[PDB]
Every structure is written in C-alpha cells, then in structure tokens.
Design a binder for this molecule. Sequence first.
Ligand SMILES: Cc1cc2nc3c(=O)[nH]c(=O)nc-3n(C[C@H](O)[C@H](O)[C@H](O)COP(=O)(O)OP(=O)(O)OC[C@H]3O[C@@H](n4cnc5c(N)ncnc54)[C@H](O)[C@@H]3O)c2cc1C
Ligand SMILES: Cc1cc2nc3c(=O)[nH]c(=O)nc-3n(C[C@H](O)[C@H](O)[C@H](O)COP(=O)(O)OP(=O)(O)OC[C@H]3O[C@@H](n4cnc5c(N)ncnc54)[C@H](O)[C@@H]3O)c2cc1C
Lengths: 602, 606
Amino acid sequence: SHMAWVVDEFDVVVIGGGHAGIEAALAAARMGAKTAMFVLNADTIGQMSCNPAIGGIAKGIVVREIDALGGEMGKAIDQTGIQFKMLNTRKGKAVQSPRAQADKKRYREYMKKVCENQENLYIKQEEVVDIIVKNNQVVGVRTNLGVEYKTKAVVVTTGTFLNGVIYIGDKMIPGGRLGEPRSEGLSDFYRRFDFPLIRFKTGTPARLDKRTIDFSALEVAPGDDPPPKFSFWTEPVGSYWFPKGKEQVNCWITYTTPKTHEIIRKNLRYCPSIEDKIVKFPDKERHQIFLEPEGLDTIEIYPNGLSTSLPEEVQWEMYRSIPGLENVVLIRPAYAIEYDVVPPTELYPTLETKKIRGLFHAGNFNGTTGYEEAAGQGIVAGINAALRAFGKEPIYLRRDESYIGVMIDDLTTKGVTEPYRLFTSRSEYRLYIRQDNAILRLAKLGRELGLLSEEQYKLVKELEREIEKWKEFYKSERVSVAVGGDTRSYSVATLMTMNYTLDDVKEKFGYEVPQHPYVKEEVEIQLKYEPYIERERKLNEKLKKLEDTKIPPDIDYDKIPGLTKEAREKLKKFKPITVGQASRIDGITPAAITALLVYLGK
Amino acid sequence: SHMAWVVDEFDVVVIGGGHAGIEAALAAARMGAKTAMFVLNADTIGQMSCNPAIGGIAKGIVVREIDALGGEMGKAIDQTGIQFKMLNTRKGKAVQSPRAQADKKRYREYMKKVCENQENLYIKQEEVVDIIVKNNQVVGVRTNLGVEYKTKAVVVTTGTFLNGVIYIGDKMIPGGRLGEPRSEGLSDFYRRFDFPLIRFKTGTPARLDKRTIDFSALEVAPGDDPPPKFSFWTEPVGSYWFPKGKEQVNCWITYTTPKTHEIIRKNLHRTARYCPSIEDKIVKFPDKERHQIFLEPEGLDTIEIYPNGLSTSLPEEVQWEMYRSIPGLENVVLIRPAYAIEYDVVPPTELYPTLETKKIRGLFHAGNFNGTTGYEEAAGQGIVAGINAALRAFGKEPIYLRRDESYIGVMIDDLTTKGVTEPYRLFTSRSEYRLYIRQDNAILRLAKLGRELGLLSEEQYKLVKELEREIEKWKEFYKSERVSVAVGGDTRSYSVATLMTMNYTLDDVKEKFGYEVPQHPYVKEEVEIQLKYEPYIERERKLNEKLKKLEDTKIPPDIDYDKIPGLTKEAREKLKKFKPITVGQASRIDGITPAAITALLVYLGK
Ligand SMILES: Cc1cc2nc3c(=O)[nH]c(=O)nc-3n(C[C@H](O)[C@H](O)[C@H](O)COP(=O)(O)OP(=O)(O)OC[C@H]3O[C@@H](n4cnc5c(N)ncnc54)[C@H](O)[C@@H]3O)c2cc1C
Ligand SMILES: Cc1cc2nc3c(=O)[nH]c(=O)nc-3n(C[C@H](O)[C@H](O)[C@H](O)COP(=O)(O)OP(=O)(O)OC[C@H]3O[C@@H](n4cnc5c(N)ncnc54)[C@H](O)[C@@H]3O)c2cc1C
C-alpha cells in the first residue's frame, strides 16, 4: 500500500532535472525505457545556475559530441543562444572550440518542453530519499512522502543539492542553490552501503542590474559572423555554421583595480573565486571580467570573473571598485555552495557503480563542475541505465575517440581532489578529437543505440562517403607549381598542406569543390591535418595496443604471476576494463602491465 | 558598514514578488517612488501556485477594477490567457463576471518582464527578516545576510511563506510552497511589537499527466466567442471584447463517484465554513452523490492538468486511489502530489482601510498574509497598499476605496472591519450596490482616481472622458426620441430609453425603428446597459440613502471615544480597537448598536 501502482513502475529512474538528469532521462526514454525523472521543483528543470553560457575550450567539443550521440544540449543552445563565437581562432581550425551566450530563461523552458513531451518519460516532483536494493541490484526508490516506486536502474544526478550549504560571509544557509531547498535523506543510503562521501565547494558571482552599469568606456566583446552552431541537426541541417547575419548581442569587458585587491585583502589548485586568485597570484595587477547578459528580457548581468563568497556588505564595496560598476546595484548576492559527492572511483567507465548493479552516477554529484561535463556524463549514464533495464551490456566511451570518454576515464581512473573541469584534461589524440568531427566520431554509436533515427544517420553516411570521394580525388589530381626558380608537381591534397585552401585551389587552378558546406570544409580540414593525425597516431600506437586489450570482468588478479601485492591491491579496487585503462592507474608499473599482458596470453 | 549604501536606499520596500507584491511594487514605482521588491527566488515572480485561472464570480470584477486603476493583472491575463468566458450569461449583463484560463508559464514571464523593466523598481533576491522602526515609524529593513536597507515605507506580502508548513498525509515539510523554501525571521518582528498572529491553512489539487487521461467521454467546456477581455487597455483598446475567432483551448468536466467518497472515508481520521478540500466537503455534505470536477490545462507547452475540485492533503498513496476512481482518470499519473499549506497571518483588524498598520506608521500588509486567499484578492489589496506606501513616502495622505464604489473597497472594508476566522474569498462578500459595481463599468468607476494618482497617463484618461461624454450624449438622445408601440390592442408612446427596460436592445431599436446607434464598441454597449439598468440602479441608490449618509460622515483620526456621552463601555471598546474612519464603517462593526451610532452622530454635531 506504500508501493506505487503498476502504472507507476519504471525501467529507469533519473534523480534530478538538471543538466546530467535531462540527458540521462531523454536518452533512456528515447531508447524505449519507461523513465521517471524526479526533481525537487518541476519548474526548475533545465535551469542554468552559474554562467549564462554553453561551450568553451573543451566544453564546446563535448556539446558537439553530445549532439552527435543524439542528446539535446546542442539543439537547446542553437535555439536559445544569443551569441556564438569560435575560441582559439588564430591557430588553425583543429584547436578551436565553440562558445555561446544563452538566454537562460529560453534555455530552461526549451528543456522543460522537450522533457515534458518526450514519449515514455514522466516527470515526478518529489524528493528521493532512498534507493531500494536487493542482492546488490537496484529494484526501487523511496521518496520523503513515504512511497516507493519500482525501477530496474537508477541514475543519480543530485548536482549541488545533496546536503547543500550556501556560504555568504559567515552565514550558512541550507539549500542546493540560492533561494532553493536542498535534499538530505539520500546521503543515509550511501553511508548505509559504505560509499565514500566527500564535499566540494564552488562559487558564483552576484547578479547585477544592467541599468546601474556604465558601459560607455568598456570594450565590446561580440560574436562571430557567420556564427557557429552547436548542433548538426538544427537549421541549417548537416552543418555547423549559421547563416551570415544572424542576430546577436554583446558582452563587455572590464578589469579589477589595485583598489579592488586592497578591499579583498582588508576583508580576509583551480580556485576561480576572485578572492582566491589574488592570493594565489599576488602579482597580477588586474584581472579580466566579462559582463554577460542573462537573456533578452531580463536586466540581470553576470560578471564572469568575480565569483566570491565574501559578506554581502563587502561584495558591494568590491563590485563598486570595478570601472563601470561604480554605482552598480546587485539583484542577487554572490555565494559559494558545498554539497555531497561520491568519489568517481566508485564507478566503472560505464558510470555504473561497482557496489550496486543498476546504479549510475553523473554530474556534480560525480565530482565534476560545469553544465557540459555533467550533460556528457548524463547521456552515458542514461544510455547504460536503459541497457541494464533491457538486460543488455552497458557500453563506455573510449578516451581515444571522444572527449566525453577522456573525462569519464580520468574521473573513474584518477579520481578527484577538487571539482573536475574539462579544460584540465589532456587528450593524447587532440588532433583527431576535434570540434568539427564529433558527428563522424560518434554518430554510428548514436544510431546503433537508437538515439539517432535511420534518416539522421543516412545523412551522415552520405556526407562521409562524399568526403572520402573528394579526398581520393584531390589525392590523384596533380598540379605543377613554380616553387621559386624550380618547378614541382603536387597533388591538391598536398597543396592543403602548403597554405592553400580549397577556395584558393579553385580560384588559381580552376578545380571543383564540394558544394555541401560540411563536406567542403571537412575535406579541407582532413587533408590539411592528415600529416599530423598520422604522426599522432604513430606515436600512440602502443597506447592503441593496450586500449584494444580487454581484461576479463571475472579476472582474479591474485592468480597472476609476476604481479606485486601492492599492485593486485590497486588492480583489485579500480577493476580496469582494458590494459590501456589499467596502465593509467596512478601507481601501476610498466612491469605490472607486462605481467598482466603475459597472463592474458599476449 | 552593515548599512546599505545611498544607491541602495529606497522610498518603498515591498516584501514579496507574488500577486500582492507585484501590484504594490509596480504601483509605487509608477508613482515615482524608488522601490525595491524583495523575493526569495527571483525566478518565481508572478508565479501562479494554485488554479491556472484568473477571474470568476467576484474575482473577475476586481481584475477589471485593478486594470482601471492602472494595475497589471488585467493586462497580464489578456496577453497570456488561453481561454476566456463570461459567467452567469443567462441573467443579464449586470451579474456577469469574466473568467479566463491562464498559461501559467507565460503569465509568470509576463509579470517578471514587466517588473524587471519598470523604471524606479529594483528586484532584490533576499529574505527580509526584520523591519526597522523608529518611534513607531518605518525607517528600514534587514535581511538574513546581516544587512540593512533604508526605506520610508514597507509593504508586507509574504503570502503562504511566513513559517509555512506543507502537509501531506502525516508528513510535515517546511516550505512556503511545494518544492520551495519558507521565510521565518520576520515573525519575530511581529511578536516583538505585540502583533496578533494566526495560522491559516489551504489546500491545492495534484498536477496530472494529460497523456494518462481519457477525455473521450468527458464533457467539453470551451470559452466564449467572441471572448471577453480583462483589460480596457489591451487591443482592441477602449473595449472589453476580443475579436471573434480568437484561438482558445478547452477544459473538461468529470465527477466523483460513490466509490471516490468511500475511498476517502476509509482513510480519514478524526480531528477537532468553506472547506474546499474534497475530503472535507463530503463530510460536510454526506448526501451529495457526486461533485463536479474541472480538468484544466496549465498552458500550451505543458502536459500538466489541474483537477479543479480535488484539493486534498491526504497521503500520496491514498491520492493515487481517489484520483483513479474518477471517470477518465482510472490510469492517471501524478506529476505533483496534492497538499495543504499552513502559514502565518496578521489579523486584518490591525489595519485601517488604507491597509496601513495601526501600530506602525508606514507599514502596510496585503494578500494571504492579510487573511485572504486567491490571486485577485491579493492583487486588489496590493495596488492599494502600494499606492498608499508611495504616498506615505512622499508625505501625502493615504487613500482608501469606499465599499459603495468598488469591490476592492468591499473586500478591504470587510477585512478591516469584520476581521477573519478563515481565509477571506471575494464571493462571500455582499455589496449593497451590486447593480452599480459591475464588470462593465469598472473603468468608469475608478479611472479618475487612477489618473489622479499618476498610474494612468493623460492619454489614457482622455479616452475615458471622451467615451464618458459620448455615452451621456447618447443617453439624452434616446431619452428624447419617442416611438409608438402596440401593447396589445393599444398604442403607447415610449422613449427609446424606456424601450431598453421593455426587452428591446439597441440592435432591436435600429432594426425595427431605424434609429442610429453608437459606433464605438464600448459606448454602444455601455449606453444600453446604463439605460436597461437605470431603474434598478436608482431604486438601489434610494434604498441605501441612509448608508450613503453615514459613509459621508467622517470621523476625526484623534477622537477620544472616552469623551463621548451616551456611549456604552462595550461600544467604546470596539470603537477604540477598530478605529473607524467614517460613521458608515463604524456602523458595520459587529456589536455596535444603532443607539451607539446616534450618540456618535450627535457628538460629531449631526
Ligand atoms: C553556487 C554554484 C557555483 C557553480 N560554479 C561553477 C563553476 O565554477 N564552473 C562551472 O562550470 N559550473 C559551475 N556551476 C554549475 C553546476 O555545475 C550546475 O549548476 C549543475 O550542478 C550541474 O549539473 P547537474 O546535473 O549535476 O546538477 P543540477 O543542475 O544542479 O541539478 C540537480 C537536480 O537534482 C535534483 N535533486 C537533488 N536531490 C534530489 C532528490 N533527493 N530527489 C529528487 N531530485 C533531486 C534537483 O531538483 C535538481 O534539479 C555552479 C553552480 C552553483 C549553484
Ligand atoms: C497550498 C496552496 C493552496 C492555495 N489555495 C487557494 C484557494 O483555495 N483559493 C484561491 O483562490 N487561491 C489559493 N492559492 C493561491 C494563493 O492565494 C497565492 O498563491 C498567493 O499566496 C496570493 O498572493 P500573495 O501575494 O499574497 O502571495 P504569494 O504569491 O505567495 O507570494 C509571496 C512572496 O513573498 C516572498 N516572501 C515570503 N517571505 C519573504 C521574506 N521574508 N522576504 C522576502 N520575500 C519573501 C516569496 O518569495 C513570494 O514571492 C493557494 C496556494 C497554495 C500554495
């Protein structure tokens, strides 16, 4: 009688309606799993609580990847962004990453609409306080209303809410976010099963009133024209560029002054709070600040670079010492949030818990910070939760093929000491894992899982085919050029390696060029970088070998000859899925890898 | 150092971004007062937490009045409403009242957008935990972040938040609303100043998934065509009707069954007037076999359905059972459970009809915190409190709305003169001038005050005056144009105006007698309504002549009731506590005897 009815039983239960939860719930539901997404306040689904932006150095590529796998974040920002630009634009297209300013309000509504109308997905406003487990297998969930719902798998994405404490000056206020409640009960479930629990703390700037800011002397920071898109599926379909002339808004730049730093001092690894970095870098005389609009209708301005947790009275003084903000009025005070986190090392690269079958974690609760890093994990967790529910085998993303894979690999293999951010990761395949080819690297898996339709993948296969045609064509079409006082014969493909664009080649030599925007650009990029991709691949050949060497899930590390005791210990807890992953465990020696390889018969 | 800077000093501080707070903050700001609107979550400004509707029996007229005074509610629902209709459409236009279904989401956004861009208005996301007083005069406000802001007046509209507790079965959860935090500290200020504090409790239904409901056999409930508008200012300007063909959505009807009722009885335990919770009205009306239920959409993008008539605070597992016993909902899935909220309330008897506190000058109260419940009742008080707060800030005298001229005035009068033992609702009030205070003439009754305060622009009022003049020209025209009619086998000479009381409409008079009619939509309809009801309005006015007499008799603010001869001791105790501003209001205090009123009239030299 405390048990919900048949009509209230699910395959997958996602705890959380944030960035991880949304991708997870949408992925599972779209794969056919009857999914329930629990949320503390149904009106906050999809809410952006920090920076009003999507994308960035590594973040932007992850979004592109989420979009390729069949997720929503990419489509959401394309439809609700108010500014788009490319970062690292002076060093070749391969190192670039897209970034956009979002209209927070429109973004939230967009995600709520897609979620509400998603077939097989049900939203439940209720606080989950416990997970029901039978023989290390997830079988249900309980809320603080004394009810229980049956489920086959659970994806936890409590974000910054679990036992959240808001910090402002010496005031401590319970909550998952400023002005919102926090969750509590679920933490007892984790202690009860002996899961390690740690607390992370991150801050956010105050929210400023646009009418009280003098922008007159500030430098304008505009978008790009034509602006890049995050989704391969939005209009223009099969392309990553918006039409030239798309309507965009501005951002403004200002800086801290020595007076700002003195105010902070009087009131006293990657610590972003202005207060922290003036102590970490006592010598920098000024710190850059980006004033960002929060939407087209709102007057709130997000001052990027001024996150703090100082008392509100001090916030007034420090914010008003910044040129342009002399008379600024705060709408929302800056603050810092501390919450519960379960160390990622408790998971396999499938995001599934080692202790309990059918339990997956994602987002800030998993030790990361950021919308994108959360959404990237969420889609994987959602995918695997559905698979589990269907009695199939969970998958994982190889770090040598996607940035989502790199992130997940570092979390579950290295663990975290502080919140993980995508820009701290080091991809050994940075030339292959680019912004322009997420679609080519992940679309197959996306279609395989059923997230992409037959039609979506058909477009991908076609373009991929067109691309290969032209590459083989330009590689067979030679041309004679006068290099100084001597004459040479080079193929068009090779000319791309010598500062020629396809447009240059057509203009000077009259050759033809792909008419499809994507094929046209992707061909140029692949030919220009072929030399480096091949060299990069050559250098990591040994990493590739290890990565392709699977380790039995039923492997008894105690029966392996030539493996130290301290090694069996680590290999016993991390439980690597491949020898390549096993070699990344901090502390394992090249010898151990050998013993293991020998034992595996290689 | 804990004190906010000069740039953070205000004339008026409104605590709350709800329905009372929005009208109060916008009114004061539009009147020129530097205004700060505090709220717990800036993203919840203008949020509708209960029924997704605006209007109804008395509520609809109050919206028309808010709009006539220069408020926003009217404009808001007109731009975000997805269904509009008139109630009591078979009993003459005088007893009709507008009602609309709102797209909750669009409505919230609309209010947030207007408030954010309103000049002189500043939004502050922060919890006010104390009000600073100097010689019984509001001087500032303090928040839970240890900071203070200077202000000259404060409007408190905590709604259902102050020490709010959510109820579901046996569970008690702190919160101002399901999924939202509650406020607490401010209650200390009131105990500290010895204010009386009571707790009211109201419930709301669950939110249902539209795709799990079978509407196949349910009665459809559409809007009207043409649909009525709430604002006189939205397009078509200077009119109360939308064009024919406006796109609207439907609502659906269902009923409870005997099985539904038996489900509630098995799960009800004993515990020590208007109790809308289905579970209460079946114990209060044991003989009713079925209860009507209106299934209404909450917006165009959302799949959430609001089951009007099924508010409850029963355990969630019991809710599943009762909701599923209702035809069409056999397999319904809840998105949000039903619950009841209990919050702090300061008895309205602590205020003058101006909504200002008798104990502290510059302090005003409005909305649920004031003892009422409903969006419209809150916004009605809000605009008044906002207006008076700004006036106070400027050193001018606060105003009040006479109950014989507006329904808002009726509400405020009843609240401050009768007090409340339960949440006050607009349909329970009784206007002795129900024929004068109509839905069609709110604009004619309140536009002058609206313009006088600065809420309406010169151009807005100019329109009202022009129409007001055309209306009068037409009435005098139809009053001098006689026609001949055959009352049986007899011939009579009647003025066109008289025919309006003999079942003739202006359209009938033109079609049959060929007379001209007004071309402006409002003039054309108001002339007809005014002529048709002139007889009753005059009779109503004659029957209340005495009431008008008493209401026009002002009572000095500093009268010493102890010095009035011929006044009982129990009568002086009521007069000293309620402190009526007119003899009319005084005669409305429960217990006051006709003799006591005479002694007072004599004392005032009458
Ligand atoms: C103060 C602050 C500072 C930040 N700083 C940074 C930064 O420096 N850099 C950066 O990139 N990003 C930052 N962020 C953004 C942050 O990473 C995201 O807000 C979010 O936490 C990430 O996505 P998520 O899915 O994990 O969680 P969230 O978006 O937070 O969502 C969690 C969801 O879980 C639900 N929930 C929690 N518990 C329960 C329960 N028991 N039952 C049901 N539902 C539950 C909540 O209702 C909520 O919808 C910051 C955010 C805040 C609030
Ligand atoms: C459970 C429930 C049952 C209901 N039942 C009915 C019904 O039967 N009939 C009907 O017509 N209507 C009903 N309603 C609707 C209700 O009348 C409105 O939701 C609202 O309370 C009325 O307007 P308001 O302005 O007074 O308050 P609200 O709209 O509730 O707003 C209050 C505002 O005050 C702010 N606040 C509170 N404390 C502080 C503080 N210390 N500092 C700063 N800000 C603060 C909050 O953030 C909030 O924005 C119900 C609502 C609920 C939640």
